[PDB]
């Protein structure tokens, strides 16, 4: 009769998923208390890095993400006004090569659904239609928008997004997400109309992760299998207030915005199938993840929220999930959970702030206006391509970077981490494993 944890996770976004999956894999009992009536058949796209994929493959889920996602062969910068080519990183076969992982472009509903069913098939409850507003972290409970109080669970995980009452609750005072002051537009249009244009035939039959950066925007653009859809995300100011978001609102909003950029995109704006305008927003790093309970912590956005620019955020939260679920491995005995979350805590921060950082980084880049810094980037940048140095102005091609955010083994990293704290050497916790004979 081994020890089973009763972990309730709450918010089945992808981190949640990813953490019931590991700790059922662990040898616990997992539930995850969702707020929206029904699972989220919805979205856009999404990037599955090496340091993702390879602990999805770890959980046999490669076939069922392969027959959905596609592969992109390459990354590439190019400049905003002529398309004009300054950084290209080889994902095929490089990525496979270094990092022994595949790097896939799957559509979120596509993803969402895969770690639901894997989910499933390892026995987690998700029980939907539980909007849990406050939280007694002592006597673990949690008490829902009607009134109901769940109390079957030995320990809690937040994973309720950007909007966390769980962070809110932790801190005891309300804590709403700073707006960036960015707007994003996700216009999608099939391939079939773009082998039709000339100029744009190279996108289609090359498929790439193509990115635009200029003046205060970017734009990103990617192939999805569904519909053989194209993904067309444009980040820019929101100087504007309106929010007026009828279909021909944004076509005449992003031509704006699209005045003097290749040509290409423009086009683009032509075969329109569906459009999409929102105003970004993240979370600023928290110190303390966990509480002095010992029973929560926090995973996901809730504790890491990053900016878009690097697309790892989705990558961090299945990091974050699998260390969870590597570290429950050894919570063989109950007075060992919250050192475990402690070690959680400290191997998870300071990898996600390191990507937060960069991400932020990325930002500067992408968004230089036209002048002497933007002159210097691609100056960098192409010099530079075939020599690279540590500051490279590409994030994903930087030769010290690069290794670290693809090369990690959120598994091998937080084994390394327990084995330091059996030998005493992990500060901040309370020093279970001695009492147990572990040593
Ligand atoms: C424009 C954009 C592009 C991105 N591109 C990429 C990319 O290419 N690659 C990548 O890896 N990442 C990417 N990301 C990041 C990725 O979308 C997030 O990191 C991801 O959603 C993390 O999942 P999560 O479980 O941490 O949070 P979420 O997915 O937000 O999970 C939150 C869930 O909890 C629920 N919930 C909220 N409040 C409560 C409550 N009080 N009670 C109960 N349930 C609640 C919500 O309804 C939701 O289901 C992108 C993000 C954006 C905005």
């Given at each position: 009769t081994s020890y089973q944890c009763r972990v309730a996770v709450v918010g089945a976004g992808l981190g949640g998923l990813s953490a019931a999956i590991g700790i059922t894999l662990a040898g616990h009992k997992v539930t995850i208390l969702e707020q929206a009536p029904q699972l989220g058949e919805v979205g856009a796209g999404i990037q599955i890095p090496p340091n993702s994929s390879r602990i999805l493959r770890q959980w046999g889920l490669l076939p069922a993400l392969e027959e959905v996602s596609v592969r992109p062969l390459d990354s590439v910068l190019r400049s905003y006004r002529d398309g004009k080519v300054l950084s290209r990183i080889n994902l095929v076969p490089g990525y496979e090569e270094r990092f022994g992982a595949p790097y896939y472009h799957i559509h979120r509903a596509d993803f969402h659904r895969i770690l639901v069913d894997k989910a499933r098939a390892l026995g987690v409850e998700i029980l939907l239609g539980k909007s849990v507003r406050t939280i007694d972290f002592n006597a673990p409970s949690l008490t829902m928008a009607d009134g109901s109080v769940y109390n079957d669970a030995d320990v809690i995980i937040g994973?309720?997004?950007?909007?966390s009452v769980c962070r809110e609750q932790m801190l005891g005072h309300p804590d709403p997400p700073h707006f960036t002051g960015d707007l994003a537009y996700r216009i999608i249009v099939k391939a079939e109309d773009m082998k039709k244009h000339d100029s744009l035939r190279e996108l289609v039959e090359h498929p790439s992760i193509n990115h635009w950066m200029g003046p205060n925007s970017h734009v990103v653009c990617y192939l999805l299998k569904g519909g053989g859809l194209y993904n067309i995300v444009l980040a820019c100011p929101d100087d504007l207030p309106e929010l007026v978001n009828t279909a021909k609102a944004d076509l005449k909003e992003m031509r704006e915005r699209f005045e003097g950029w290749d040509p290409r995109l423009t086009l683009l704006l032509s075969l329109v199938q569906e459009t999409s305008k929102w105003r970004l927003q993240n979370s600023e790093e928290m110190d303390k993840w966990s509480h002095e309970s010992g029973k929560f912590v926090l995973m996901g956005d809730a504790c890491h929220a990053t900016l878009p620019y690097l697309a790892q955020g989705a990558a961090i939260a299945v990091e974050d999930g699998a260390a969870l679920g590597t570290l429950f491995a050894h919570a063989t005995h109950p007075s060992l959970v919250p050192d475990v979350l402690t070690i959680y805590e400290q191997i998870r921060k300071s990898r996600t702030t390191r990507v937060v950082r960069g991400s932020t980084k990325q930002r500067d880049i992408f968004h230089m206006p036209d002048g002497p810094r933007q002159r210097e980037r691609d100056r960098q940048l192409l010099t530079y391509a075939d020599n690279l140095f540590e500051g490279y102005p590409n994030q994903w091609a930087d030769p010290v970077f690069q290794p670290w955010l693809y090369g990690y083994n959120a598994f091998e990293e937080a084994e390394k981490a327990w084995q330091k704290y059996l030998r005493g050497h992990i500060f901040g916790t309370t020093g279970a494993f001695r009492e147990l004979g572990m040593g």
């Open positions: 994973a309720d997004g950007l909007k």
